[PDB]
Symmetry: none
Subunit: 46 residues, 4 copies
Amino acid sequence: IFDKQRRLQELSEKVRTCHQEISALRKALQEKEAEVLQVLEDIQTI
Amino acid sequence: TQQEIFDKQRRLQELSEKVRTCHQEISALRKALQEKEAEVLQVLEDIQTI
Amino acid sequence: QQEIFDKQRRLQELSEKVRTCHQEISALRKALQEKEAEVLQVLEDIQTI
Amino acid sequence: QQEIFDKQRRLQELSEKVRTCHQEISALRKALQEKEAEVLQVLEDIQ
């Protein structure tokens, strides 16, 4: 049925939308982690 | 009690406080992820149903 | 008709694959969080030192 | 006293533990993205 396909497109586009959010959010996370890691490294470097 | 010791100490405290700015940001950014992730998981559950 | 069947088949298969991704994405995510939370405790215990 | 150095040795032990935890996380992230990517390509084909 076409209706099922249409409903899937609604949801499918929606999951594409969320993922891109998830991605950049995840990029933001790595950076903050990679940062505290740099701070710990600096603490030994004092 | 030397000045150099203190200077390092001040830097040390600065670094410890900085671990906070990171803890907070990490900790809240982590919530934002597990809500966005969860949201998408529910969509997936909807797609599974049809 | 077969075109209709072919379509239904493909759709059923998709739901199954999506389910299996679901439970895996789900398990990974929970492994991450707990690991992610294990780090935080270490970080909070670093600030205490 | 100049026991700051001993605090530093202890800090080093804890930092090693988070560096190790972070090695896992990344590997877990790589798997999840692959899986997230997987389930995307599944949907893209459904039409």
